[PDB]
Ligand binder design. Structure first.
Ligand SMILES: *[C@@H]1O[C@H](CO)[C@@H](O)[C@H](O)[C@H]1NC(C)=O
Ligand SMILES: *[C@@H]1O[C@H](CO)[C@@H](O)[C@H](O)[C@H]1NC(C)=O
Ligand SMILES: *[C@@H]1O[C@H](CO)[C@@H](O)[C@H](O)[C@H]1NC(C)=O
Ligand SMILES: [Ca+2]
Lengths: 49, 98, 315, 54, 36, 49, 158
């Protein structure tokens, strides 16, 4: 649900494929500095805790 | 909790690179235009307007997943057992699982 | 020590990434904070920085620290390596890129190391919160009380089970290796590293020259040059430019890894229990915000849970 | 027995061909070896044998 | 950079009014040089 | 009443006799270190203040 | 550096004003805080002292600081000029009576400079508030986002 309980759903603790719905969106690096800015929904697991 | 790893972007100094979706959880890519980065040394490449940046990010399991992680279970009827202790007559207490 | 853990960090080199604020204004600070990971319980946090700790120029000695002031590495004694969140944190252990400290809650994380004429700090806006273990919200770990399972970070450098990826450092920009000799540009070679030169004097001039090369360009401005050093690795930070399609990947052990240990939690004062017919009166005088949860033992649970901060009475 | 590839030289992953001090014969070759063999199940066996000097 | 803005030795563009004001804006201190 | 106003009741400021009901439990030392851990109801006087 | 930016200060001299707290009690301190003026957005505050920063009795060198140890002036190399509100602040710049520092949102403003043995610190009770710009409140200036107009004390002395 994009960050409420299930946002990182891994089938087992060492599965290779995992479902992630964090609404990750990238942003323009600005001002001539090199970086990868991104904004995304906070962790659902923390909210559940 | 997740961890959103950000691979090092590419800067095709002059020209443009397009990007290719890859089999990664919640992968995101976006080519930007006219970046003109500056590094500790200089302006990282010449042509003012024609400089792109890959900027790909993809999310994975946090390292703390190995230690703390909520486990989802579907629960069925299962079985019921007990520890009992019995004493009869002169025999002292004897306990066992049942 | 000298087993795999520290030996493995011989291949890595420090690097210069964009810090968001060293003192004032953006910069390219040798110690750039990346991934300050606070999720442990007692206030222990871990910071992955851009300057290695424990290496020196040849061999591994804990007290030293290696960082790049330019194209050249530089190893100095750990003189004052401080992590500060809102009050000075206490360093637990520093290994390779990573530094583990115990911090009070706060809204920034800053790391700084001296070389004696320079300060070399970096700060970052990360919310680090003291996460109590148990049912009593306490602000610093108690002296005594009850041990409880609690996830911490290890202070064993020991290599196990987790990894980070370090690739070849892509071509790094530099212009101090461009000098005007006679009437034209001159690219100088670092004695062991290639240099890739791109000058648009008005027809494009390229080349990867391993010897001191002079091109036909008038001013230094229209040339750009990037040295290629392949001898060492770097963490594939999002703050370093990667070499276009040269997507080769590597692995490196991460020293401090989450494990489950015992952390002490506080014990609330024993409540004053007073009895009445079919009622239990509890006078609670907690010293920290404390949970109180009751449930009947019959069919109807009637679960009543609440937090108590002030001294109260509940029936 | 696990088995790592180095640039059309198959070889094991507990001994490399650079045994005495791998990171001083040719560092570049050390890291190209430890980066080709990235998904090798035995990668700590490779690292501990490509980082061991004497 | 812009014609109305100074360019340091390391390509960085600053305002012309911020030149020879005593404070080392550019990392390499290029703005405060050639100051008679 | 162990921590509401009367928890220290000395008849005069310099009276040897003294009444005290701070609910002083005494916890065991743990982990092989030397100390006397106690839990205790906070001061009734502070609560009153 | 000197055209008029700093030459003007050869007339001004440091003075010894009363400080609310010298560190244990009230004393006349060679560095007395007056007019901590925080109204900028990023947490940058400009604080006015009773010491001349960047002036040396003979002239400008911009690593020296002069203060009055009595009726007699004296100029020293800045040993540790620190500003602190709840955690150490970052000294953006200093000139004449003023020092511009980026500060955490704290509750008391403290300045202090060492001399040798001696501490020479002063502290005033002034609320320093972090004033985020925009429609989201944020406890510390982000790395990335959207540029918005804000008012900040320029670090140029002009
Ligand atoms: C009940 O069983 C326990 C478990 O073996 C035993 O220790 C105990 O003695 C028994 N009850 C009594 C009253 O002895
Ligand atoms: C019952 O609870 C109320 C509400 O907290 C409290 O005011 C009252 O004192 C309690 N009863 C007794 C006998 O104390
Ligand atoms: C490895 O050796 C074979 C035989 O000599 C050769 O055909 C092949 O091209 C070599 N591998 C590479 C990558 O050149
Ligand atoms: Ca200037």
């Amino acid at each position: 649900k994009a960050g409420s309980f299930g946002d990182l759903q891994s089938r087992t603790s060492t599965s290779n494929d995992l479902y992630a719905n964090t609404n990750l969106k990238l942003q323009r690096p600005q001002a001539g500095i090199v970086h990868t800015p991104f904004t995304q929904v906070p962790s659902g697991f923390e909210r559940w805790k | 909790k997740y961890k959103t790893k950000v691979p090092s972007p590419v800067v095709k100094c002059c020209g443009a690179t397009q990007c290719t979706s890859k089999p990664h959880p919640d992968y995101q890519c976006q080519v930007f235009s006219g970046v003109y980065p500056f590094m500790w040394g200089g302006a990282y490449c010449f042509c003012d307007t024609e400089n792109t940046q890959m900027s790909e990010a993809y999310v994975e399991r946090s390292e703390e997943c190995s230690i703390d992680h909520a486990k989802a279970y579907k629960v069925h009827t299962g079985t019921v057992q007990a520890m009992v202790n019995i004493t009869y007559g002169s025999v002292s207490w004897r306990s066992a699982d049942v | 020590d000298l087993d795999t853990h520290f030996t493995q960090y011989k291949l890595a080199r420090p690097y210069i990434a964009d810090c968001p604020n060293c003192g004032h204004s953006r910069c390219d600070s040798p110690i750039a904070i990346e991934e300050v990971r606070g999720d442990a319980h007692a206030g222990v946090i871990r910071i992955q920085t851009s300057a290695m700790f424990g290496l020196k120029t040849d061999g591994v000695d804990l007290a030293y620290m290696s960082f790049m002031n330019g194209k050249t590495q530089k190893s100095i004694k750990i003189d004052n390596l401080h992590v500060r969140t809102s009050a000075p944190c206490s360093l637990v252990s520093h290994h390779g890129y990573y530094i583990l400290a115990q911090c009070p809650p706060g809204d920034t994380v800053t790391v700084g190391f001296h070389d004696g004429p320079n300060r070399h700090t970096c700060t970052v806006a990360h919310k680090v919160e003291f996460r109590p273990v148990g049912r009593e919200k306490y602000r610093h770990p108690p002296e005594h009380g009850v041990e409880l399972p609690c996830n911490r970070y290890t202070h064993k450098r020991a290599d196990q089970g987790h990894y980070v990826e370090m690739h070849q450092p892509g071509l790094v920009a530099d212009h101090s290796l461009l000098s005007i000799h006679s009437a034209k540009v001159k690219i100088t070679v670092p004695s062991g590293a290639q240099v890739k030169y791109y000058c648009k004097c008005p027809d494009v001039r390229k080349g990867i020259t391993s010897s001191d090369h002079t091109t036909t360009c008038t001013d230094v401005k229209q040339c750009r040059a990037y040295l290629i050093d392949n001898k060492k690795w770097v963490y594939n930070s999002g703050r370093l430019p990667r070499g276009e399609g040269d997507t080769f990947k590597g692995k490196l052990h991460v020293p401090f890894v989450p494990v489950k240990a015992k952390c002490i939690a506080t014990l609330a004062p024993e409540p004053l229990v007073e009895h009445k017919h079919r009622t239990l009166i509890l006078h609670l005088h907690p010293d920290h915000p404390t949970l109180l949860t009751t449930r009947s033992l019959g069919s109807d649970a009637n679960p009543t849970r609440q937090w108590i901060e002030r001294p109260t009475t509940v029936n | 027995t696990v088995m790592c590839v180095l640039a059309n030289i198959t070889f094991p992953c507990d001994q490399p061909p650079c045994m005495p001090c791998c990171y001083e014969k040719n560092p570049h070759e050390t890291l190209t070896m430890l980066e080709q063999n990235y998904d090798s199940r035995a990668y700590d066996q490779l690292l501990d044998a490509a980082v061991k000097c004497n | 950079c812009e014609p109305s803005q100074f360019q340091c030795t390391n390509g960085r563009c600053i305002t012309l009014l911020w030149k020879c004001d005593g404070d080392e804006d550019c990392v390499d201190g290029s703005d405060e040089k050639n100051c008679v």
